[PDB]
Nucleic acid binder design. Structure first.
Lengths: 213, 103, 94, 59, 39, 23, 230, 63, 125
RNA sequence: AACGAGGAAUUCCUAGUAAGCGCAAGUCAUCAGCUUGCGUUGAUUACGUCCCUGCCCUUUGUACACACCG
């Protein structure tokens, strides 16, 4: 076999950096704990629209992602989860508290369900983003609901807004908090098992379209 | 009920499963598997709650006589569960069977 | 590209130095006898080595993989690359 | 489907030659733009009536 | 279910309330009047 | 009010209906 | 073979408002009900069909329409019904004007029309009404629209006369488990059944004979209690 | 029930459609021949994959 | 002389001065080692340039960082930009241009806010 | 004794914007019941359309090729 060498004195520093950070350098993981290899969108038509191409350290890339039309579509997914988690009534504008909530939720998911928490997030999104919607037709008085298809970006934005709004309405007036019930709701969402708020709303949407096709 | 949460942090009741309204006598985890918890409640039935869907018992276990107070898993098999009642008849059940009747 | 100088040793380790600072950067170990011929492509993609253990080695240089390992019959004594056609000629022992 | 009906309409004009020569430029421009846009589906199809229609309108 | 019953239809304290409203209204009104005539 | 394209299509529709019927 | 439940105190069923958006239950709305306010001038009052007709006329609307009697009587039989004892339905009134009303399933509707009307005008100007114990607001005027107040897993039908007839027992046994029902009734005096046909899915009929809204509500209540064994 | 996938090719214009409805031409993905005019509710650009339930019907003006 | 170099980093209203000189392989930020930046969730964002490139290139140098003004996240982005441009400048001045270029390519391919800042001036129509 | 986030109607807004948090001043008109500065934190959703609502402009190629219509 054959070996590449790039190292001749093992890296010593005067200000010691912990072992977790060293292994993070040799492989970027989100909050140093979850990889991005073996993370895939299972369905097409969204591989373009939920970007998990490029790894990230903490979900706070402060780039200008909303000046153009589709820089929103470029922006990475966990950023969107923190943002739509911050969108609130009493809590507009505390992104640090929001991202700590995301980290707490991510740990709760990884502890309960084994597989991979970020993979659970992406599969939940692609399982709940609704497929066939309706709109109003005026018609001049004889008005009704008519069924059309829906764009991928609208699917992603709709799925995310529904998921976070379901979490908040779950922890509205309860002894549970937003991180806990969002974790449970996301896990059931990736399960696709008909007890999740977004899942109920999604099947209700497509059946509305079915009913007045 | 049972309450399950990660150690070192009493603040966060992580999950609260309401089993039968009888007192849940003993609660343990699997040994080989890691996401399936077992509760023996005094209702003469022991339940296997899959910790993802805590709403319903993933598998019941009935046929006991009175007051199942202990249970143990088994090393080689993750499918073979032993229950100790309170009138004898240490029972041995399968899970990859139907599971209502003991082996 | 004028940056990288290649030393082919007599124990097999091809060693790559940067020639601005005279500093060492990279090290590959394929052959088992002495290395005898080294060259790099004009686009700085691929790398050709040949050694008396009868072995021609093809490398990438953008990455650091092993592309190809060819075995010829006689050992290889002299090597000349030519870049404009991407063809290289070896002088053998038969 | 309306493209197909358009082609049959053109072939009926080629049967009724006298309506042709007062609108030859309009016929040609519309026909060529329709085919050049909708080319891929129309060429990947297979229909012998379509082949004969194309042949006659060409001639 | 327990049911209930609907509701629909301190005098000196409420009299103090109405007198206070009248005091406020009258003082503000006279202030407006003095302002206008002086201007 | 019907748009260009739509008016053409439905008129072409009726015309092709009658021609194919007569054939 | 199976133990009895541990406690046997027969407890009250859990009382329900709209804030629960999970539990499978029933909801009845009264559509286009006529509950209108006016200020006679030195007294506010609810518009009533019989006694004041020329003042309805000087306002210009239709005495054929302005009538809350059917609303009152339908409300009485519904909030008296035994499923309302079992605690499994709640009431939404969608006025002719547009106001949403959530009626808690614990109120006791005043039996006489005059007391009922006095309550109604107090509600329509005040926006909330407390009990005689004064810690729970039993009547809640709330914000359009109603489907933004309903539970999530619902089917929405209207009760029309022209619709094909079914057996409601058959329908509730055709339902799924967590799938609640949402029946829109037309408490109009005389009007077209076109009020919520963009809101709800389908029309339903209970006889080939015309009814009242009241006996239609009773029919739906008793089909419910027979389907749910209560 | 079979779901299917297609590719948005070319955004149509000038048709009298409601705000929020866009009329577009899709080529079916796995079957490289059939093109259908359909509608979309969200913002669409050229060249993106789109999910479809109903097969046979071509769209139209939505008034 | 001592082979040295100096750079600036700048978020919205903060300033991050970075001296870089040859040394024993340490970091110092405001007279305190860099295991002790405050916000404790963005400490990794501060760590980002080192973990992007590697560690030996920061084993053979000396950084000294001083920041003033701004708030938390602004300071943090300032420090990371300062460390980035300082490392690139030191490499440009005292070691090989090829190392400078591969550094620059890896950085800008990851995230351009490291090498150029955006002082956000508005767009009036 | 009122009160658990405030109905019907109605008003506004497309990135350092909505919103949140404070510190300073008090500039020949206004403002102290307040007014104006500055920094901090920083979002969701449109960026297309004339289909409704309204508004305008043009209905004479006039301007010099090619093209287009007539």
């Amino acid at each position: 076999d054959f070996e590449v060498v790039e190292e001749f004195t093992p890296v010593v520093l005067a200000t010691p950096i912990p072992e977790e950070v060293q292994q993070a350098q040799t492989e970027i993981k989100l909050f140093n704990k979850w990889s991005f290899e073996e993370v895939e969108v299972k369905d097409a038509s969204l591989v373009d629209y939920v970007q998990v191409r490029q790894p990230i350290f903490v979900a706070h890339t402060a780039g200008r992602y909303a000046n153009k039309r589709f820089r929103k579509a470029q922006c990475p997914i966990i950023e969107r989860l923190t943002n739509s988690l911050m969108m609130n009534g009493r809590n507009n504008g505390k992104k640090l508290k929001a991202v700590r909530i995301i980290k707490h939720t991510l740990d709760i998911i990884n502890v309960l369900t084994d597989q991979n928490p970020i993979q659970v997030v992406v599969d939940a999104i692609t399982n709940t983003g609704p497929r066939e919607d309706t709109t109003r037709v005026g018609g001049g008085g004889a008005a009704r609901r008519q069924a059309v298809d829906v764009s991928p970006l609208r699917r992603v934005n709709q799925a995310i807004a529904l998921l976070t709004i379901g979490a908040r309405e779950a922890a509205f007036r309860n002894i549970k908090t937003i991180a806990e019930t969002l974790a449970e709701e996301l896990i059931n969402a990736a399960k696709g098992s008909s007890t999740s708020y977004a899942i109920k709303k999604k099947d209700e949407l497509e059946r509305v379209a079915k009913s007045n096709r | 009920l049972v309450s399950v949460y990660d150690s070192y942090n009493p603040r966060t009741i992580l999950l609260s499963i309401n089993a039968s309204t009888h007192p849940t006598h003993v609660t343990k985890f699997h040994t080989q598997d890691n996401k399936i918890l077992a509760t023996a409640s005094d209702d003469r039935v022991t339940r296997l709650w899959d910790i993802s869907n805590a709403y319903e018992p993933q598998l019941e276990l009935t046929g006991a006589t009175d007051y199942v107070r202990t249970l143990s898993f088994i090393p080689a098999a993750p499918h073979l569960v032993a229950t100790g009642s309170y009138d004898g008849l240490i029972r041995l059940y399968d899970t990859r069977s139907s599971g209502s009747t003991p082996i | 590209c004028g940056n990288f100088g290649f030393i082919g040793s007599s124990n097999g380790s091809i060693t790559i130095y940067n020639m601005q600072s005279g500093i060492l950067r990279k090290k590959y170990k394929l052959h088992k006898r002495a290395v005898t011929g080294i060259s790099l492509d004009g686009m700085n993609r691929k790398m050709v080595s040949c050694g008396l253990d009868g072995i021609v080695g093809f490398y990438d240089f953008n990455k650091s993989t092993l592309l190809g390992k060819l075995k010829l019959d006689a050992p290889i004594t002299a090597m000349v690359y030519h870049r404009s056609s991407d063809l290289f000629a070896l002088a053998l022992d038969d | 489907s309306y493209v197909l009906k358009f082609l049959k309409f053109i072939d009926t004009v080629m049967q009724n030659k006298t309506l042709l020569h007062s609108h030859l430029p309009l016929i040609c421009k519309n026909l060529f733009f329709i085919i050049k846009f909708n080319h891929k589906e129309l060429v990947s199809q297979k229909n012998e009536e379509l082949k004969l229609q194309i042949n006659r309108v060409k001639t | 279910i327990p049911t209930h019953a609907p509701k629909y239809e301190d005098r000196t304290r409420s009299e103090i309330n109405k007198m206070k409203a009248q005091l406020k209204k009258e003082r503000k009104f006279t202030m407006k009047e003095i302002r206008k005539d002086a201007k | 009010s019907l748009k260009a394209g739509e008016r053409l299509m439905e008129a072409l529709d009726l015309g092709i209906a009658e021609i194919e019927g007569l054939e | 073979q199976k133990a009895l439940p541990a406690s046997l105190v027969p407890q009250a069923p859990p009382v329900l408002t709209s804030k629960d958006k999970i539990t499978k239950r029933m909801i009845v709305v009264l559509a286009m009900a006529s509950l209108e306010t006016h200020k006679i001038s030195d007294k506010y009052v609810l518009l009533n069909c019989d006694d004041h007709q020329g003042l309805l006329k000087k306002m210009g609307r239709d005495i054929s329409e302005a009538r809350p009697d059917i609303t009152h009587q339908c409300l009485l039989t519904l909030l008296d019904s035994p499923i309302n004892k079992a605690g499994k339905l709640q009431v939404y009134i969608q006025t002719s004007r547009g106001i949403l009303i959530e009626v808690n399933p614990t109120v006791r509707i005043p039996r006489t029309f005059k007391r009922f009307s006095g309550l109604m005008v107090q509600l329509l100007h005040k926006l909330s009404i407390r009990s005689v114990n004064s810690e729970e607001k039993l009547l809640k005027v709330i914000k359009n629209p109603i489907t933004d107040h309903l539970p999530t897993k619902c089917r929405k039908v209207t009760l029309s006369f022209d619709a094909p007839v079914i057996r409601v027992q058959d329908y509730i046994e055709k339902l799924d488990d967590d799938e609640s029902i949402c029946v829109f009734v037309g408490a109009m005096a005389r009007g077209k059944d076109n009020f919520a046909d963009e809101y709800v899915d389908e029309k339903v009929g209970l006889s080939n004979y015309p009814l009242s809204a009241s006996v239609a509500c009773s029919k739906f209540c008793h089909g419910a209690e027979d389907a749910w064994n209560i | 029930t079979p779901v299917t996938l297609a590719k948005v090719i070319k955004v149509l214009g000038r048709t009298g459609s409601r705000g929020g409805v866009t009329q577009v031409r899709v080529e079916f993905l796995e079957d490289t021949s059939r093109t259908i005019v359909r509608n979309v509710k969200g913002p669409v650009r050229e060249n993106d994959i789109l999910v479809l339930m109903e097969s046979e019907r071509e769209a139209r003006r939505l008034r | 002389a001592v082979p040295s170099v100096q750079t600036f980093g700048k978020k919205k209203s903060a300033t991050a001065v970075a001296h870089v000189k040859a040394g024993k392989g340490l970091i110092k930020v405001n007279g305190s080692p860099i295991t002790l930046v405050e916000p404790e969730i963005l400490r990794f964002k501060v760590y980002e340039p080192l973990l992007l490139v590697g560690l030996d290139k920061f084993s053979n140098i000396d950084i000294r960082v001083r920041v003033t003004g701004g708030g938390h996240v602004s300071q943090v982005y300032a420090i990371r930009q300062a460390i980035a441009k300082g490392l690139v400048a030191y490499h440009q001045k005292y070691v090989d241009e090829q190392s400078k270029n591969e550094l620059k390519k890896a950085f800008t391919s990851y995230d351009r806010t490291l090498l150029i800042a955006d002082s956000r001036r508005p767009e009036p129509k």
